[PDB]
Amino acid sequence: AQQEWGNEFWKNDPRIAPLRGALATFNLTVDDLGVASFHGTSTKANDKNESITINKMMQHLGRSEGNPVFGVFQKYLTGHPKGAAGAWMLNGAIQILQTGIVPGNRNADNVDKILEDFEYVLYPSRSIQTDGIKACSVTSFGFGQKGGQAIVVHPDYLFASLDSETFEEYKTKVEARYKSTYRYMHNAIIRNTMFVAKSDPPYTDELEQPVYLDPLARVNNCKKNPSKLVFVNADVQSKQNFVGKSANDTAKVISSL
Amino acid sequence: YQKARIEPRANLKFEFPPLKSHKEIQNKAPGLEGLLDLERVIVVTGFGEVSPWGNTRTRWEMEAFGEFSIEGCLEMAWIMGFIKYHNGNLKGKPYTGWIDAKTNEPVEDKDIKKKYEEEILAHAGIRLIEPELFRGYNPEKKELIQEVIIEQDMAPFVTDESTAQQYKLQHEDAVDILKSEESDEYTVTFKKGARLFVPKALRFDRLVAGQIPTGWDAKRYGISEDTISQVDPVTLYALVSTIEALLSAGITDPYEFYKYVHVSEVGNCSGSGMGGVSALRGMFRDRYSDKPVQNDILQESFINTMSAWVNMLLLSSSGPIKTPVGACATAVESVDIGVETILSGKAKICLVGGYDDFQEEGSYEFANMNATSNSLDEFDHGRTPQEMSRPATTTRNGFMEAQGSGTQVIMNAELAIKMGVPIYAIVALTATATDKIGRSVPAPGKGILTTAREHHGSLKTKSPKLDIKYRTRQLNKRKDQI
Amino acid sequence: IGAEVLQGLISGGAKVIVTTSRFSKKVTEYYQDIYARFGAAGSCLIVVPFNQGSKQDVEALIDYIYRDVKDEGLGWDLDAVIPFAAIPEAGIEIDELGSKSELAHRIMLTNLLRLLGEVKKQKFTRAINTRPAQIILPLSPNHGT
Amino acid sequence: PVFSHLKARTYDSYWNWARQDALSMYFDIIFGKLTDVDRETVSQCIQLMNRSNPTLIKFMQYHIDHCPEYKGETYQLAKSLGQQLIDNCIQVANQDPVYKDISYPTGPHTEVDSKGNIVYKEVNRKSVRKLEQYVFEMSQGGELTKEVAEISSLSEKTSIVDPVSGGIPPETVPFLH
Amino acid sequence: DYQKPWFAKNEKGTCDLEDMTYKQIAERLVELMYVRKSQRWIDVTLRNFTGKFLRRIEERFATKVGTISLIQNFSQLEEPEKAIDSVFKAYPEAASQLINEEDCDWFLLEAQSPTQKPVPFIPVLDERF
């Protein structure tokens, strides 16, 4: 029910766009897509063609006039890595959300004359500190008709959907995890041991096949080395795995008759 | 009158997202409470990269601020091998800080941006092609071989027994081999009409590329030499943005995944565009030219074996693997595969991203397609290498090739709240779309325009499920039937 | 002075061509920041590398301004020439008339008068006698004082 | 001869930097870097009226119609200061652009401390507050020279109530002539 | 059972040295090498070791190029709360951020230093235990 009515109500609806309904699931509008991280390879044919689509997407969806997307073009200082590009643009669009800074194309010294008919796109040349970006849009184009587009929403629209008991239990777990990876990353910088390649899988050889056939087999800590965490025989096809708390410790009213 | 001063050493903190309060969040986004199924919400949990501008922390403060801070210049000088750490004793006095690498001087953290700021900005980004980073590839002397038929017989020379039988096997009447009556060597004379290959060199136009900073070594991240000498150079870029995407999530041990998730539920949908092109050169040219290439150079050329070395060295998962190819958009395609593996239920954590490499042969072929900027034509316009990539500018001419990788870690929202990992983003949708009929492969089109498609022909009302009041009313009466 | 006359001309709505001897990335980003902040509707700023000590340079520049756009020029017609180019020479008496002193005199007097001779020739061969170019000379009060 | 017509950098795109400067002014007011009592705020509204087209008036209207004025006084300030700039840029449509030096006419000052150090700074002139008072100060001359609501009004053309030519003292020279 | 207790301690019991914040270290030293009843330190070198740590707090969380140390001389550590609360007032995120491994190497190399009384605790189990 939560995905018929809350989460993916819009999927094969001909009245709701995908790009509109992907924002409508967090009660956002089309006007809340702040930044559009362009592919933007400094190619004559690419940069004109990409601005046509993002303008025509916003024009068809009824984005209000005077609301352009801030087109950021990351490839002025990194270049085009021809396949790691959509991951750099997705890493960059995440940092626009959590900071609010919309960076500027510092190699844009004179934006093209044709690009002023696209009134739904703004091309900044220096970084502007927005009060907050709610959604970005990473689009990229490949050789061989390989257009793609990802939409990325600020994570505070997930934490709205939780309750105060789930969020506070989450918040103390992520701050206890931050102290564990602060200690690791400060050690691993000065000792050059970020990558610790494993030598063994978390099971032995005659635990390898019993683990694969049990969907409820989870790793616990070893006893002779608590820093190493492995599959033991008691985790595999265990007797406390399917049976739980709410229906079996409270099976004193259903097993009493 | 000489008061005690303070020297500001760098305070590197590897910060998580800044979680604001719950009352602030629900005032900003009211209405959503129990309406979203968290298992159908894909979140980005960690991310990392290797770039011409270092990693994902030093690239951002160059992209946003235009210069490095004292903690992003220490992080950059550590990457490029300028400073080392040394705890203990040197020159008698006990010292426990950072130490220069060329000399052994105790550099202070305040003096990083006055000592190495020249060398960091000169050896990162979109500088000229440095030949020591590409096994001696000098684009100003681009090597070919020319087939020549000799019109006069050649001076005889000595060789091995097996090699002389290989010259006779190729061209038979254009060689006469002859065994030495004393030793077990042969005399080879190439008579006229034989074909040779004389090397020549030409001046190639494309001299600028965006390289990984000079001094980047994957042993600094902990990768052993037995992995360095075996795998392709792209696999090292994929292995250190996977360990950086996992450490951006607080996953310091990848086997912590298996306290919440079965081993068949950790995927890997990273992909490349061309794969290990440094191994494709080793089997198509370097073995044709009899250079000593390793025997399993075919297995390092596959696009899917960079994500195999991730599972072979880090993850040990038996979960899905779906490696895509998009060749310029293969990390947005890889996100599309990664969110569909998790929404189907086949995986719960999915490594996702893209990786590629700059090499000589692909650089020459992009120039033949007229896709890359003519770097000598940009010198006629007075452009620096640092300003040869100008998107949306009226005088733009071709792209600028780079190398590196980028990796995200996507998972369920319900699993991410349970593990207590940081959530950086929400992947709202991902789409992929081809174009119309043409006869030109590297030509873009308006194909992704179908991600905003809507029918509003004569419809006079809104869609009734476009307001959250109605959808919370139908869901709450369905929650009562359950 | 000339960089402040430039941003007043540009914010007034004029088409300005600016010459530079030290053409670099720092210089062309200085002038782009002027247009990005102090531009106006219909204004245009053009930055060229230009050495006023050279005679072939002051002839190639004015020809580029008056050439047609199909002949890879600007198609313009000057309305003002503000020749503020100089060399800061100091400590030079009557007996140290060196190479820097003779070069600076070619910039400030000889090729200045040659630059106005080119502007007259381009207007005369196109028969432009109803559009004079106003020369603003940077005179001085102190002649050897 | 260091010249080429290939190295010529042309800048034309006022239409993009107008919207970029209108937005960066909008967040400097919100984050407390600009106030209406500043010389930098009024000097930025002057450039937004020179670079005025109907697409910027759409841009600056949207961000002040959808301005969350309840969030603070700087959100109330940006909606109030920005609304005056809407009406100013509407009236100066179909007009020529304007060079106005609205800055402060500073003057010199040199000072030696007791420790011994030449410091130089450009301080505000006492009598002369704006540039119209600079032209009056230039016409009066010196003694040995003698012989034997600001944002909303940037669109309205002022009338000269008295010319400075009447206020020149007789038979003496001004500072600029 | 031993006179040199295990140094590292936070909430949820004992820990390693890298699990304590910069404030939890600086007030565990005063818990261990400052006597409350007789109002003295154990040694004058143990008072300067606490002051050299407090100067490492101010160095870590500092300004652009250099400012005034709040501990201008170690003689003001005879009232140790007044010097501690003045440092974590100027640098308030030192009360919540754990100690770097570089500063832990400083803490363990200063503890093994001559011309200093050996520390009245045990900071690490190692070959130097």
Give the start-end residues of each E strand in B14-111. 42-50, 83-85, 88-89, 94-95, 98-100
Residue A145 CA to its chain's centroid (Å): 25
Residue C82 CA to its chain's centroid (Å): 6
Strand-pair category, B42-50 with A229-230: unpaired
Gyration radius of chain E's alpha carbons: 14
The Cα A84–Cα B364 span in angstroms is 20
The Cα B129–Cα B207 span in angstroms is 6
Nearest to A201 by CA among B315, B349, B351, B266: B315
Pinpoint the alpha helices (H) of A61-144: 85-99
The answer to whether chain A touches chain C by having 3 or more C-beta pairs less than 8 angstroms apart is yes
CA atoms within 13 A on the CB side of A205: 0
Question: What is the DSSP code (8-state) at residue C69?
Answer: T
Q: Which residue, among D7, D10, D11, D13, would best test binding to A if mutated, counting the most A CBs under 10 Å from its CB?
A: D13
Q: How far is CA B431 from CA A74, B331, B338, B449, in A?
A: 21, 12, 12, 10
Asked whether the beta carbons of residue B354 and residue A49 sit closer than 8 angstroms, the reply is: no
Q: Tokens for B144?
A: 């070919």
Check if E102 contacts A (Cβ < 8 Å): yes
Check if B465 contacts A (Cβ < 8 Å): yes
Contacts of C23 in chain D (CB under 8 A): 2, 7
In the numeric block, the tokens 């073009």 are attached to: A73
Chains with at least 3 CB pairs less than 8 angstroms from chain B = A, C, D, E
Signed CA dihedral, A117, A118, A120, A122: sign only: negative
End-to-end CA distance of chain B: 79
In the numeric block, the tokens 């020149």 are attached to: D168
Check if B457 contacts C (Cβ < 8 Å): no
Catalytic residues of B: 328
Q: Which residue, among B212, B258, B401, B434, would best test binding to A if mutated, counting the most A CBs under 10 Å from its CB?
A: B258
Signed CA dihedral, A211, A217, A223, A228: sign only: positive
Write the burial class of residue B103 (CB in 10 Å: 0-12 exposed, 13-18 middle, 19+ buried). exposed
Coil, strand, or helix at residue E125? coil
Give the start-end residues of each E strand in B235-357. 266-268, 271-272, 349-356
H/E run at residue B363: helix B360-368
The conformational region for residue A126 under phi > 0 = left, psi -120 to 50 = alpha, else beta, is beta
Structure-derived torsion over alpha carbons of residues B282, B284, B290, B296, reported in degrees to the nearest 10 = 50
Q: How far is CA A138 from CA A91, A128, D20, in A?
A: 10, 19, 21
| Whether the Cβ atoms of residue E109 and residue B96 lie closer than 8 Å to each other | yes
| Whether the Cβ atoms of residue A109 and residue D11 lie closer than 8 Å to each other | yes
Cα of A182 to nearest chain E Cα, Å: 8
> Which residue numbers come right before each break in chain C (C to N over 2.5 Å)?
none
Check if C64 contacts D (Cβ < 8 Å): yes
Coil, strand, or helix at residue C113? helix
Residue type, D60: M
Contacts of B382 in chain C (CB under 8 A): 23, 49
Q: Tokens for A67?
A: 């609301």
In the numeric block, the tokens 């406390």 are attached to: A240
The Cα D59–Cα A119 span in angstroms is 9
Task: Name B98's bridge partners.
Answer: B85
H/E run at residue B462: none
Q: Which of residues 5-34 of C touch A (CB under 8 A)?
A: 28-29, 32
| Whether the Cβ atoms of residue B250 and residue A177 lie closer than 8 Å to each other | yes
Check if D131 contacts C (Cβ < 8 Å): no
Give the start-end residues of each E strand in B51-141. 83-85, 88-89, 94-95, 98-100
| Whether the Cβ atoms of residue A105 and residue A70 lie closer than 8 Å to each other | no
Neighbours of E90 (CB within 10 A): 14
Check if D20 contacts A (Cβ < 8 Å): yes
Cα of D2 to nearest chain C Cα, Å: 6
Q: How far is CA A216 from CA A237, A238, B224, B267, in A?
A: 7, 8, 35, 18
Data resolution in angstroms: 3.1
Nearest to A57 by CA among E44, E31, B14, B453: B453
The Cα E23–Cα E61 span in angstroms is 13
The Cα B336–Cα B408 span in angstroms is 12
C46 to chain D: closest CA residue: D10
The Cα B186–Cα A180 span in angstroms is 69
Check if D4 contacts B (Cβ < 8 Å): yes
Q: Tokens for B283?
A: 């089997």
Neighbours of B97 (CB within 10 A): 17
Coil, strand, or helix at residue A218? coil
Q: Domain of residue E73: give its range.
A: 7-124
Check if A29 contacts D (Cβ < 8 Å): no
Nearest to A190 by CA among C133, D58, B10, B447: B10
Cα of A8 to nearest chain E Cα, Å: 41
Asked whether the beta carbons of residue C49 and residue B382 sit closer than 8 angstroms, the reply is: yes
Cα of A22 to nearest chain B Cα, Å: 5
| Whether the Cβ atoms of residue A175 and residue E96 lie closer than 8 Å to each other | no
The Cα A83–Cα D5 span in angstroms is 37
Nearest to A78 by CA among E62, D84, D114, B209: B209
The Cα B41–Cα A54 span in angstroms is 25
Nearest to A72 by CA among A88, A58, A56: A88
* Length of chain B (residues): 482
DSSP C78-106: -SEE---------S--TT---HHHHHHHI
| Whether the Cβ atoms of residue A41 and residue B402 lie closer than 8 Å to each other | no
Q: Which residue, among B96, B107, B110, B252, would best test binding to E if mutated, counting the most E CBs under 10 Å from its CB?
A: B96
Residue type, B459: L
